[PDB]
Swiss-Prot record:
It comes from Homo sapiens. Changing K73A: Loss of kinase activity. This is Inositol-trisphosphate 3-kinase A. Expressed in brain. GO terms for cellular component: cytoplasm; cytoskeleton; cytosol; dendritic spine; glutamatergic synapse; nucleus; postsynaptic actin cytoskeleton. The chain holds residues 196 to 461 of 461 of the full protein. Substrate binds at K73, R94, K121, P122, R123, Y124, M125, Q126, W127, R128, K228. Its main location: cytoplasm.
């Protein structure tokens, strides 16, 4: 029915407010005129609320009767290349990121990180990518909100193809119609991405696919979160499949989407 960090209730029905970020505002404005228009939440412009700027977005949960939601972070890389430059010239040591690391694998931090009780953001993000499915499959499950009100973010070590399949298997709860609709939507999204003027021109980092379904077998998928999506310089383009090597700005977005369609197609035959 309604999603209600960055989010606030909107005046108009079926809308949601999200804290304005300049990269995200640029991106949503472009996407409304792109092949991808139908694959992203409708963007209605910016509004002021308590002296601060908000994106007026379509509430993706509005069409659904008690929605189940899964957030899938897309790409082999989850940080901008500029973070790698900043961490070499002027590292911001992060003590929070060190404690999250210790918790999952106490042997993961180096002798110096242990001494620092702190890690760089890129180091933490590369580690996160490697213990989840991000590095190998080019996406990872971030979270589920079920129809019973229960939520989980317990997916940091969800890595193998079969582990990912079991999360989707539990998420769709044997609803053949929801899974068929999800696969049809993902096939149509892949086709739209492969012709999109926006997509060939932009490095898409930190974006998610939001899967939404309900007990009436309504099912939708949208791309969300363009806070780290940046244009390539002087008419350079990405294939979004080839491996990332510092300088090439490749995100593996379509490697991810390919693997995700493969896993859902496998689940459909089980
Ligand atoms: N347009 C939308 N309508 C309804 N729910 C949304 C919408 N956009 C995002 N959400 C929900 O809010 C969550 C956060 O979205 P996101 O755009 O990633 O926010 P963020 O705080 O900017 N980034 P992140 O750090 O990745 O969570 C999603 O996982 C959804 O559950
Ligand atoms: O999911 P966990 O393991 O908690 O890690 C978190 O992953 C976010 C991306 O999902 C990052 O956000 P980002 O989109 O890069 O701004 C956070 O970074 P930050 O603390 O804000 O510098 C980072 O801690």
């Amino acid at each position: 029915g309604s999603h209600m960090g960055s989010f606030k209730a909107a005046g108009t029905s079926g809308l949601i407010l999200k804290r304005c970020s300049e990269p995200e505002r640029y991106c949503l404005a472009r996407l409304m005129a792109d092949a991808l228009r139908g694959c992203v939440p409708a963007f209605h412009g910016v509004v002021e609320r308590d002296g601060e700027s908000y994106l007026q977005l379509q509430d993706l949960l509005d069409g659904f009767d008690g929605p189940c939601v899964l957030d899938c972070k897309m790409g082999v890389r989850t940080y901008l290349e500029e973070e790698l430059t900043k961490a070499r010239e002027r590292p911001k040591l992060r003590k929070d990121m060190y404690k999250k690391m210790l918790a999952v694998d106490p042997e993961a931090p180096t002798e110096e990180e242990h001494a620092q009780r702190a890690v760089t953001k890129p180091r933490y993000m590369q580690w996160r990518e490697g213990i989840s499915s991000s590095t190998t499959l080019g996406f990872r499950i971030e979270g589920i909100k079920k129809a019973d009100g229960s939520c989980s973010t317990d997916f940091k070590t969800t890595r193998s193809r079969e582990q990912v399949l079991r999360v989707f298997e539990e998420f769709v709860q044997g609803d053949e119609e929801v899974l068929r609709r999800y696969l049809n939507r993902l096939q149509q999204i892949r086709d739209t991405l492969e012709v999109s003027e926006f997509f060939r021109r932009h490095e898409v980092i930190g974006s998610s696919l939001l899967f939404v379904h309900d007990h009436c077998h309504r099912a939708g998928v949208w791309l969300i979160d363009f806070g780290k999506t940046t244009p390539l310089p002087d008419g350079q383009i990405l294939d979004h499949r080839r491996p990332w090597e510092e300088g090439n700005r490749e995100d593996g977005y379509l490697l991810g989407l390919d693997n995700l369609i493969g896993i859902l197609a496998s689940l459909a035959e089980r």
